[PDB]
Amino acid sequence: IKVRENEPFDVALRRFKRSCEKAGVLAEVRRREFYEKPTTERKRAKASAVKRHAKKLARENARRT
Template structure:
């Protein structure tokens, strides 16, 4: 599972965008969709 640590003075929106991008790179959503019934 990808993790993202907030940097000093980093807005939450930016961290969320980084988290979404790291999930995409790791293939998390594709994996969930493939296991969906």
């Protein structure tokens, strides 16, 4: 938001820009909000994270090591 990084950055050097929103408030409220799909899609996206967690507990077992 308010960057100086005075002398030694030369371009941006803004990891904070990609840690505040980066597309957050912006790219999400551009258009197509649907008012109810976010409730369902995020639960489906979180269910994919259950599958990402399902990988972990069956991992580090044999895996030809």
